[PDB]
Amino acid sequence: EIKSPHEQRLEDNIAGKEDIYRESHKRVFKLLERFDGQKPAIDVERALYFTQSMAETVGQPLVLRWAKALMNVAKNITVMVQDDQLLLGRCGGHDGRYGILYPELDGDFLDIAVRDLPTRPQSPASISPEDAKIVVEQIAPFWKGRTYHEALNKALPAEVHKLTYDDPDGLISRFIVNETSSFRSSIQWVHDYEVVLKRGFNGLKQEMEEKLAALDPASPVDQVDKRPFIEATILVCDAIVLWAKRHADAARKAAEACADPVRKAELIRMAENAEHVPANPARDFYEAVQSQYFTQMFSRLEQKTGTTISNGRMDQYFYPFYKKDMEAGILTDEKTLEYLECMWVGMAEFIDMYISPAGGAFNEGYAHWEAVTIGGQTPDGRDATNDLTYLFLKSKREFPLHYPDLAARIHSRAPERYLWDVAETIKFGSGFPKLCNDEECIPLYVSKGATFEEALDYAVSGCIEIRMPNRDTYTSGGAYTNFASAVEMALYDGKMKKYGDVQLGIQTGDARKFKSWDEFWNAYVQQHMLLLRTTFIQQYIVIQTRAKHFAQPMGSVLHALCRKHCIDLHQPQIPEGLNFGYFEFMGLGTVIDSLAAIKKLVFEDKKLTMDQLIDALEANFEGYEDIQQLLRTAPCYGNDDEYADEIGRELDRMAVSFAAKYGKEMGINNDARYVPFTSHVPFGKVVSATPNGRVAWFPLADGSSPSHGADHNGPTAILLSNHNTKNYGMRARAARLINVKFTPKCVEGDAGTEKLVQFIRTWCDLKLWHIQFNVINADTLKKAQKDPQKYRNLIVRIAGYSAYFVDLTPDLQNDLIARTGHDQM
């Protein structure tokens, strides 16, 4: 009926009109028009200079090798000044959208990427013949037998390898117990950006030089274990300062050749910035943005942080600079938005490239989660809403890209003006911001060793994870576990149709011969527990293997505990640190509804037999549409239906109870999480037809959202089912991703915004970690599917992030279309 602001801006763009927000954001609109929707190009510069150094330092301490390699990167990488930009900093020589390579992580995929990336279905990338030659002749040869993925592949035992990979080289995943440490250097992370703003890398280098001079020259521990770390942090401090100085030199060369006196003044000011920061503490808001921007951009050169390096509570640590400059009359809100959005433009040019097939399937639509945290509470416990908070919401509404990854913190005393503006930003229809509940994760974290000061100042990281940038020390990518495959294995005696006669799971027998609900439930529990055992065994190998392949000198020098004990973050145990790891429960809604359909329609109501059920499944419901339609009448997750929710609660109890028992012996919290990336698409592609009516190879239920079209009792019931399927008596849990879609008419006007605010307050009281919203009409998606070039600017909320709908595979588009769009609350 009515269109959201995004849909209206979409129609104006298609009709050829100027966007209504272009004039008051003219500079950044000029910037983003130069690359919007361009297929990103692979850049080889970082990997080349990184490889050149690593090849000459083999055998030395890993963290020192990393710093020497980053210095080689800083001296040689292309430094450029883009037109109209107010910021310096870039990770490649290509102009426009670009991604870089990390051969230390997944170098064994380099030949695969060279031939498959330009035409790959998920997030493709071009590679010029000049770039391909450098890759296959100068980058790939050194890394053969040396990459992390090869080490992980050869280190998994047979029974774990069979549930991890399909081929002996680990090049193709099976999407059963999926490792995620091979397509990202680490999980999400947030640097302590305020220590750079307040002390600069010159100050950190000074602190480390005092530690270097205090070492006992006779102590073998000081000289063998501590000294290489200290030398690495000192060298990496000089590396980033040299890198910034080269940008300052480039800005002055640009200034000498510029006829425009207004641009010449800007170029000189940019040069002055790079000559002060990040070496020295920032002195105004402009320098603070440029200082933070340099650090996060240099971080991308350091390692491929999961979901791309996140940014922390910008509306807090930028605020002293904003308030001082505003009151000094050297800044305005309009100038603030220009500085910040120049940072979004720069971030939007950097594409986080996943070159393996598994990594591409996990991150459709050039997925990115560089979380920017706003709102919430102060370290002392009062509300933290300020004028910068509202500007980020304003920037997100008017800036047309799906940047930044804006996350708003909610607590029980969040101001109404704040919740109102968040609700109105959500009603814009691009999926921003995502909500994180102080009330759920803060009590969990203080329970796991965090002080209240550390927990209250948490920053969202990645999808909806939280970080305490001077307390968190765990960086190992976790397992993603396909519990929907446990249902399939319980039907077919530990086998899956996708993999033929390969004995994947327990031989629980032919489900056609099962005589009671007890017998099928036991079969599932056996496969369920098997996936859990494989998950944790795989994880422990990942922890031990990553310690031999990854170092993070810059990230470590930004961590107070790493400076204090002189040890790199990617080591398994760091003194006084807290380790928050994860394993993923995938397919919750698909698993619940499948088991509920079997319990209800087979063994309680006797409405069909196991033969009818498995006959329909093995036929993919072809000729059996009556049984498919019958299966969809069983109780489902997401309706506040205790019949279904009690099954999900027990599924959760098994995973959380297992996590609490076996995490501690790995020395970490390895908690159950329900955050999917886009892995519910490839996980679905390996699972055949399921007892809930889902056809073969269709995506699974996303995160902890209800199965597609299974929520027939309104949106609030989704909140109650999430609450009813959790186990608040235990703590071995983490986030759950909730996706809810409203029609614009559902939330129309001031009456609609009020309904959404009360909905968010109910979501908060229920201690639910996360929630997201699409506000869109179904016909918008159907028109975008049929005519994708006309609707190429349509933006939809997927899983922690928004992306262009036409960049998504048909499978993921079908996930988006099949999600229930609620017309009333």
Short mmCIF file of N, CA, C and O in Angstrom, two decimals, residues 717-824:
data_model
loop_
_atom_site.label_atom_id
_atom_site.label_comp_id
_atom_site.label_asym_id
_atom_site.label_seq_id
_atom_site.Cartn_x
_atom_site.Cartn_y
_atom_site.Cartn_z
N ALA A 717 4.92 -12.83 18.84
CA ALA A 717 5.11 -14.25 19.14
C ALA A 717 6.53 -14.71 18.82
O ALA A 717 7.05 -15.62 19.47
N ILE A 718 7.18 -14.08 17.83
CA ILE A 718 8.57 -14.41 17.52
C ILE A 718 9.46 -14.12 18.72
O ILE A 718 10.39 -14.88 19.02
N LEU A 719 9.20 -13.00 19.41
CA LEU A 719 9.98 -12.66 20.60
C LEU A 719 9.77 -13.68 21.72
O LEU A 719 10.72 -14.07 22.40
N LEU A 720 8.52 -14.12 21.92
CA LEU A 720 8.24 -15.06 23.00
C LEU A 720 8.83 -16.44 22.71
O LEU A 720 9.31 -17.11 23.63
N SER A 721 8.82 -16.87 21.45
CA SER A 721 9.41 -18.17 21.12
C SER A 721 10.91 -18.16 21.33
O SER A 721 11.48 -19.14 21.83
N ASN A 722 11.58 -17.07 20.96
CA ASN A 722 13.00 -16.94 21.24
C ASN A 722 13.26 -17.04 22.74
O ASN A 722 14.20 -17.72 23.17
N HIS A 723 12.43 -16.38 23.55
CA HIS A 723 12.59 -16.46 24.99
C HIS A 723 12.31 -17.87 25.50
O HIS A 723 13.02 -18.37 26.38
N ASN A 724 11.28 -18.53 24.95
CA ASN A 724 10.87 -19.84 25.44
C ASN A 724 11.80 -20.97 25.01
O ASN A 724 11.69 -22.08 25.55
N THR A 725 12.69 -20.74 24.05
CA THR A 725 13.64 -21.75 23.59
C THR A 725 15.04 -21.53 24.13
O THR A 725 15.98 -22.21 23.69
N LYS A 726 15.22 -20.59 25.05
CA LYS A 726 16.50 -20.35 25.71
C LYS A 726 16.50 -20.99 27.11
O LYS A 726 15.46 -21.36 27.66
N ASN A 727 17.70 -21.09 27.68
CA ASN A 727 17.91 -21.69 29.00
C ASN A 727 18.66 -20.68 29.88
O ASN A 727 19.89 -20.75 30.04
N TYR A 728 17.91 -19.74 30.45
CA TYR A 728 18.50 -18.67 31.24
C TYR A 728 19.13 -19.16 32.54
O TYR A 728 19.80 -18.37 33.22
N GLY A 729 18.94 -20.43 32.91
CA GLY A 729 19.62 -20.98 34.06
C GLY A 729 21.08 -21.31 33.84
O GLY A 729 21.80 -21.57 34.81
N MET A 730 21.53 -21.32 32.59
CA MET A 730 22.93 -21.54 32.27
C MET A 730 23.48 -20.33 31.54
O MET A 730 22.74 -19.45 31.10
N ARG A 731 24.80 -20.28 31.40
CA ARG A 731 25.44 -19.13 30.81
C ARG A 731 26.23 -19.44 29.54
O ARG A 731 26.61 -18.50 28.84
N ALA A 732 26.43 -20.71 29.21
CA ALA A 732 27.23 -21.07 28.04
C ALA A 732 26.52 -20.74 26.73
O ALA A 732 26.37 -21.61 25.87
N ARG A 733 26.05 -19.50 26.58
CA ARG A 733 25.39 -19.05 25.37
C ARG A 733 25.95 -17.69 24.96
O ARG A 733 26.59 -16.99 25.74
N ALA A 734 25.71 -17.34 23.69
CA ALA A 734 26.05 -16.02 23.18
C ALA A 734 24.86 -15.45 22.42
O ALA A 734 23.70 -15.67 22.80
N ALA A 735 25.12 -14.70 21.35
CA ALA A 735 24.06 -13.98 20.66
C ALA A 735 23.16 -14.92 19.86
O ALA A 735 23.53 -16.04 19.48
N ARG A 736 21.94 -14.45 19.62
CA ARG A 736 21.01 -15.03 18.66
C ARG A 736 20.58 -13.94 17.70
O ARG A 736 20.14 -12.87 18.13
N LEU A 737 20.68 -14.21 16.40
CA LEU A 737 20.27 -13.25 15.39
C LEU A 737 18.79 -13.42 15.10
O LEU A 737 18.35 -14.52 14.76
N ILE A 738 18.02 -12.35 15.23
CA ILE A 738 16.59 -12.36 14.94
C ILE A 738 16.34 -11.41 13.77
O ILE A 738 16.72 -10.24 13.82
N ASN A 739 15.70 -11.92 12.73
CA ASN A 739 15.25 -11.12 11.60
C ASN A 739 13.73 -11.06 11.63
O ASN A 739 13.07 -12.10 11.70
N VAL A 740 13.18 -9.85 11.62
CA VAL A 740 11.74 -9.63 11.53
C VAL A 740 11.49 -8.64 10.40
O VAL A 740 12.21 -7.64 10.27
N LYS A 741 10.50 -8.93 9.57
CA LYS A 741 10.15 -8.06 8.45
C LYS A 741 8.75 -7.50 8.65
O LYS A 741 7.80 -8.25 8.88
N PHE A 742 8.63 -6.18 8.55
CA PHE A 742 7.35 -5.49 8.58
C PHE A 742 7.05 -4.88 7.22
O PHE A 742 7.96 -4.53 6.47
N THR A 743 5.77 -4.77 6.91
CA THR A 743 5.40 -3.91 5.79
C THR A 743 5.43 -2.46 6.24
O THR A 743 5.28 -2.17 7.43
N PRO A 744 5.66 -1.52 5.32
CA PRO A 744 5.61 -0.10 5.72
C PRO A 744 4.28 0.32 6.31
O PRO A 744 4.26 1.15 7.23
N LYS A 745 3.17 -0.25 5.83
CA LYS A 745 1.86 0.11 6.39
C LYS A 745 1.72 -0.39 7.82
O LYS A 745 1.00 0.23 8.62
N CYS A 746 2.37 -1.50 8.16
CA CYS A 746 2.32 -2.02 9.52
C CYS A 746 2.83 -1.00 10.53
O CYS A 746 2.32 -0.94 11.66
N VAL A 747 3.82 -0.19 10.15
CA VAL A 747 4.48 0.74 11.05
C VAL A 747 4.26 2.18 10.60
O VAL A 747 5.12 3.05 10.83
N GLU A 748 3.12 2.46 9.97
CA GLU A 748 2.89 3.78 9.38
C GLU A 748 2.67 4.85 10.44
O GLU A 748 2.03 4.62 11.46
N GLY A 749 3.21 6.05 10.17
CA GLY A 749 2.89 7.22 10.97
C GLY A 749 3.43 7.17 12.38
O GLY A 749 4.18 6.28 12.79
N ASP A 750 3.07 8.21 13.15
CA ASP A 750 3.48 8.28 14.55
C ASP A 750 2.91 7.12 15.36
O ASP A 750 3.57 6.63 16.28
N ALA A 751 1.70 6.67 15.04
CA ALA A 751 1.14 5.50 15.71
C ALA A 751 1.97 4.26 15.43
O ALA A 751 2.09 3.39 16.31
N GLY A 752 2.53 4.14 14.23
CA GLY A 752 3.37 3.00 13.93
C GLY A 752 4.71 3.06 14.64
O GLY A 752 5.18 2.05 15.17
N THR A 753 5.32 4.24 14.69
CA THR A 753 6.59 4.39 15.38
C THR A 753 6.44 4.05 16.85
O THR A 753 7.33 3.44 17.45
N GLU A 754 5.31 4.44 17.45
CA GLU A 754 5.05 4.11 18.85
C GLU A 754 4.95 2.60 19.05
O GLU A 754 5.45 2.06 20.04
N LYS A 755 4.30 1.91 18.11
CA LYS A 755 4.19 0.46 18.21
C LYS A 755 5.56 -0.20 18.12
O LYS A 755 5.84 -1.18 18.81
N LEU A 756 6.43 0.33 17.25
CA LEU A 756 7.78 -0.22 17.11
C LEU A 756 8.62 0.04 18.35
O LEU A 756 9.45 -0.80 18.73
N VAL A 757 8.44 1.20 18.99
CA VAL A 757 9.17 1.49 20.22
C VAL A 757 8.76 0.53 21.33
O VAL A 757 9.61 -0.03 22.03
N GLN A 758 7.46 0.32 21.51
CA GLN A 758 7.01 -0.64 22.52
C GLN A 758 7.44 -2.06 22.17
O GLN A 758 7.70 -2.87 23.06
N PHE A 759 7.52 -2.37 20.87
CA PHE A 759 8.04 -3.66 20.45
C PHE A 759 9.50 -3.81 20.84
O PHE A 759 9.93 -4.88 21.31
N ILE A 760 10.29 -2.75 20.67
CA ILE A 760 11.70 -2.80 21.05
C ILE A 760 11.84 -2.89 22.57
O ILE A 760 12.73 -3.59 23.08
N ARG A 761 10.97 -2.21 23.31
CA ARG A 761 11.02 -2.29 24.77
C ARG A 761 10.68 -3.69 25.25
O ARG A 761 11.27 -4.18 26.22
N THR A 762 9.73 -4.36 24.59
CA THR A 762 9.43 -5.75 24.93
C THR A 762 10.60 -6.67 24.57
O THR A 762 10.97 -7.55 25.36
N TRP A 763 11.20 -6.47 23.39
CA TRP A 763 12.40 -7.21 23.04
C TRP A 763 13.50 -7.01 24.08
O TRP A 763 14.27 -7.94 24.36
N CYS A 764 13.58 -5.82 24.67
CA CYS A 764 14.61 -5.54 25.67
C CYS A 764 14.30 -6.25 26.99
O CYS A 764 15.18 -6.88 27.58
N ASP A 765 13.05 -6.16 27.47
CA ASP A 765 12.69 -6.79 28.74
C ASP A 765 12.88 -8.30 28.70
O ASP A 765 13.18 -8.91 29.74
N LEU A 766 12.72 -8.91 27.54
CA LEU A 766 12.87 -10.36 27.38
C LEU A 766 14.33 -10.80 27.34
O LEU A 766 14.58 -12.00 27.19
N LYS A 767 15.28 -9.87 27.49
CA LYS A 767 16.71 -10.18 27.49
C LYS A 767 17.14 -10.88 26.20
O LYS A 767 18.00 -11.77 26.22
N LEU A 768 16.55 -10.49 25.08
CA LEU A 768 16.97 -11.01 23.79
C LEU A 768 18.14 -10.17 23.28
O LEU A 768 18.09 -8.94 23.31
N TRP A 769 19.18 -10.85 22.79
CA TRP A 769 20.45 -10.20 22.49
C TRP A 769 20.33 -9.21 21.33
O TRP A 769 20.87 -8.10 21.40
N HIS A 770 19.66 -9.61 20.26
CA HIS A 770 19.71 -8.87 19.00
C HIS A 770 18.35 -8.89 18.33
O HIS A 770 17.52 -9.77 18.59
N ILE A 771 18.11 -7.89 17.48
CA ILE A 771 16.97 -7.89 16.57
C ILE A 771 17.26 -6.93 15.42
O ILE A 771 18.00 -5.95 15.58
N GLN A 772 16.67 -7.22 14.26
CA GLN A 772 16.83 -6.46 13.02
C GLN A 772 15.48 -6.33 12.33
O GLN A 772 14.57 -7.11 12.57
N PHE A 773 15.37 -5.34 11.44
CA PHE A 773 14.11 -5.13 10.75
C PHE A 773 14.30 -4.82 9.28
O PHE A 773 15.16 -4.01 8.91
N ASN A 774 13.52 -5.49 8.44
CA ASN A 774 13.20 -5.01 7.10
C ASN A 774 11.83 -4.33 7.14
O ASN A 774 10.90 -4.83 7.79
N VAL A 775 11.71 -3.20 6.47
CA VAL A 775 10.44 -2.49 6.31
C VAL A 775 10.25 -2.30 4.82
O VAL A 775 10.77 -1.33 4.24
N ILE A 776 9.52 -3.21 4.18
CA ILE A 776 9.47 -3.28 2.73
C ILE A 776 8.23 -4.05 2.32
O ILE A 776 7.69 -4.85 3.10
N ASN A 777 7.76 -3.82 1.10
CA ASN A 777 6.66 -4.58 0.52
C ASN A 777 7.23 -5.74 -0.28
O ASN A 777 8.27 -5.61 -0.93
N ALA A 778 6.52 -6.87 -0.25
CA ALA A 778 6.98 -8.06 -0.96
C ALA A 778 7.11 -7.81 -2.46
O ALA A 778 8.01 -8.36 -3.10
N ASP A 779 6.24 -6.98 -3.03
CA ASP A 779 6.29 -6.74 -4.47
C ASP A 779 7.59 -6.05 -4.88
O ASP A 779 8.04 -6.21 -6.02
N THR A 780 8.19 -5.27 -3.98
CA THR A 780 9.48 -4.65 -4.30
C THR A 780 10.52 -5.72 -4.59
O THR A 780 11.29 -5.60 -5.55
N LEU A 781 10.54 -6.78 -3.79
CA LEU A 781 11.50 -7.86 -4.00
C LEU A 781 11.19 -8.63 -5.28
O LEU A 781 12.10 -8.99 -6.03
N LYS A 782 9.91 -8.89 -5.55
CA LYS A 782 9.56 -9.64 -6.75
C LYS A 782 9.89 -8.84 -8.01
O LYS A 782 10.39 -9.41 -8.99
N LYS A 783 9.66 -7.53 -7.99
CA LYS A 783 10.06 -6.72 -9.13
C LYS A 783 11.58 -6.66 -9.28
O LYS A 783 12.08 -6.63 -10.41
N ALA A 784 12.32 -6.65 -8.17
CA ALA A 784 13.77 -6.61 -8.25
C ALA A 784 14.34 -7.93 -8.77
O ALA A 784 15.37 -7.93 -9.45
N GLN A 785 13.68 -9.05 -8.46
CA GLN A 785 14.12 -10.34 -8.97
C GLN A 785 13.93 -10.43 -10.48
O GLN A 785 14.79 -10.97 -11.18
N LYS A 786 12.81 -9.93 -11.00
CA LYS A 786 12.54 -10.06 -12.43
C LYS A 786 13.35 -9.06 -13.26
O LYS A 786 13.86 -9.42 -14.33
N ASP A 787 13.49 -7.82 -12.79
CA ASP A 787 14.23 -6.78 -13.50
C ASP A 787 15.33 -6.26 -12.59
O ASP A 787 15.23 -5.17 -12.02
N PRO A 788 16.43 -7.02 -12.44
CA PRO A 788 17.47 -6.62 -11.48
C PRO A 788 18.25 -5.38 -11.88
O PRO A 788 18.73 -4.67 -10.99
N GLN A 789 18.39 -5.09 -13.17
CA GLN A 789 19.15 -3.90 -13.56
C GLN A 789 18.39 -2.62 -13.23
O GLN A 789 19.00 -1.62 -12.83
N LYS A 790 17.06 -2.64 -13.36
CA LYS A 790 16.28 -1.46 -13.01
C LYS A 790 16.30 -1.20 -11.51
O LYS A 790 16.30 -0.05 -11.08
N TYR A 791 16.33 -2.26 -10.69
CA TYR A 791 16.26 -2.13 -9.24
C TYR A 791 17.60 -2.37 -8.56
O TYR A 791 17.65 -2.78 -7.40
N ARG A 792 18.71 -2.09 -9.26
CA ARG A 792 20.03 -2.45 -8.77
C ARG A 792 20.45 -1.70 -7.51
O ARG A 792 21.45 -2.08 -6.89
N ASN A 793 19.71 -0.67 -7.09
CA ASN A 793 20.02 0.05 -5.86
C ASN A 793 19.15 -0.37 -4.67
O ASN A 793 19.15 0.32 -3.65
N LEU A 794 18.41 -1.47 -4.79
CA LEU A 794 17.58 -1.92 -3.67
C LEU A 794 18.45 -2.55 -2.58
O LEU A 794 19.32 -3.38 -2.86
N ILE A 795 18.22 -2.13 -1.34
CA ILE A 795 19.02 -2.56 -0.20
C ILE A 795 18.11 -3.27 0.80
O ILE A 795 17.06 -2.75 1.18
N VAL A 796 18.53 -4.46 1.22
CA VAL A 796 17.76 -5.30 2.13
C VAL A 796 18.65 -5.78 3.27
O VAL A 796 19.86 -5.97 3.10
N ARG A 797 18.04 -5.98 4.44
CA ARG A 797 18.76 -6.49 5.61
C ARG A 797 18.80 -8.01 5.54
O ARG A 797 17.76 -8.67 5.45
N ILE A 798 20.01 -8.56 5.58
CA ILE A 798 20.20 -9.99 5.36
C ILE A 798 20.48 -10.70 6.68
O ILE A 798 19.63 -11.43 7.20
N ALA A 799 21.67 -10.46 7.24
CA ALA A 799 22.07 -11.16 8.47
C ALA A 799 23.21 -10.36 9.10
O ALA A 799 24.39 -10.63 8.84
N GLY A 800 22.86 -9.40 9.95
CA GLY A 800 23.84 -8.52 10.52
C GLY A 800 24.24 -7.37 9.64
O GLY A 800 24.87 -6.42 10.14
N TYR A 801 23.87 -7.39 8.36
CA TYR A 801 24.33 -6.41 7.40
C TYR A 801 23.27 -6.23 6.33
O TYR A 801 22.41 -7.09 6.13
N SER A 802 23.36 -5.11 5.63
CA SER A 802 22.51 -4.86 4.47
C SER A 802 23.36 -4.95 3.21
O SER A 802 24.57 -4.74 3.23
N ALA A 803 22.71 -5.30 2.10
CA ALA A 803 23.42 -5.46 0.84
C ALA A 803 22.46 -5.14 -0.30
O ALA A 803 21.26 -4.97 -0.10
N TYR A 804 23.02 -5.07 -1.50
CA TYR A 804 22.23 -4.88 -2.71
C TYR A 804 21.57 -6.20 -3.09
O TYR A 804 22.25 -7.21 -3.29
N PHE A 805 20.24 -6.18 -3.22
CA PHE A 805 19.46 -7.39 -3.45
C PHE A 805 19.86 -8.09 -4.74
O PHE A 805 19.84 -9.33 -4.80
N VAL A 806 20.23 -7.34 -5.77
CA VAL A 806 20.56 -7.97 -7.04
C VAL A 806 21.91 -8.67 -6.99
O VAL A 806 22.19 -9.53 -7.84
N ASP A 807 22.76 -8.34 -6.01
CA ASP A 807 24.03 -9.04 -5.85
C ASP A 807 23.88 -10.42 -5.24
O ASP A 807 24.86 -11.17 -5.18
N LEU A 808 22.68 -10.78 -4.77
CA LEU A 808 22.47 -12.02 -4.04
C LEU A 808 22.10 -13.15 -5.00
O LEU A 808 21.44 -12.92 -6.02
N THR A 809 22.52 -14.37 -4.67
CA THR A 809 22.15 -15.51 -5.47
C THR A 809 20.64 -15.72 -5.39
O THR A 809 19.98 -15.21 -4.47
N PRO A 810 20.05 -16.43 -6.35
CA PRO A 810 18.62 -16.73 -6.26
C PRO A 810 18.22 -17.40 -4.96
O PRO A 810 17.18 -17.07 -4.39
N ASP A 811 19.05 -18.33 -4.46
CA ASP A 811 18.73 -19.02 -3.21
C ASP A 811 18.56 -18.03 -2.06
O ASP A 811 17.58 -18.09 -1.31
N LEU A 812 19.52 -17.11 -1.92
CA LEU A 812 19.44 -16.13 -0.84
C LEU A 812 18.31 -15.14 -1.07
O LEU A 812 17.67 -14.68 -0.11
N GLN A 813 18.04 -14.79 -2.33
CA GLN A 813 16.87 -13.97 -2.63
C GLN A 813 15.59 -14.67 -2.23
O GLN A 813 14.67 -14.04 -1.70
N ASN A 814 15.52 -15.99 -2.46
CA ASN A 814 14.34 -16.75 -2.04
C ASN A 814 14.19 -16.75 -0.53
O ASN A 814 13.06 -16.76 -0.02
N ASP A 815 15.31 -16.78 0.20
CA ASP A 815 15.24 -16.63 1.64
C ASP A 815 14.60 -15.30 2.01
O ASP A 815 13.66 -15.24 2.81
N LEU A 816 15.07 -14.21 1.39
CA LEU A 816 14.51 -12.89 1.66
C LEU A 816 13.03 -12.81 1.31
O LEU A 816 12.23 -12.26 2.08
N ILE A 817 12.63 -13.37 0.17
CA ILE A 817 11.24 -13.27 -0.26
C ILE A 817 10.34 -14.11 0.63
O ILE A 817 9.21 -13.71 0.95
N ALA A 818 10.81 -15.28 1.04
CA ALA A 818 10.00 -16.20 1.83
C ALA A 818 9.83 -15.77 3.29
O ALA A 818 8.98 -16.33 3.98
N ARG A 819 10.63 -14.82 3.78
CA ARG A 819 10.45 -14.34 5.15
C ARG A 819 9.11 -13.63 5.27
O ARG A 819 8.74 -12.81 4.42
N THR A 820 8.37 -13.93 6.35
CA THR A 820 7.05 -13.34 6.54
C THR A 820 7.14 -11.83 6.69
O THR A 820 7.88 -11.31 7.54
N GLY A 821 6.37 -11.11 5.87
CA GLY A 821 6.20 -9.68 6.02
C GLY A 821 4.93 -9.35 6.79
O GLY A 821 3.83 -9.45 6.25
N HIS A 822 5.08 -8.97 8.06
CA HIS A 822 3.94 -8.74 8.94
C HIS A 822 3.26 -7.40 8.62
O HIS A 822 3.91 -6.35 8.65
N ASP A 823 1.96 -7.45 8.31
CA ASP A 823 1.21 -6.24 8.00
C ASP A 823 0.58 -5.58 9.23
O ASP A 823 0.16 -4.42 9.14
N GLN A 824 0.49 -6.28 10.36
CA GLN A 824 -0.07 -5.69 11.57
C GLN A 824 0.72 -6.18 12.77
O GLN A 824 1.36 -7.23 12.74
#
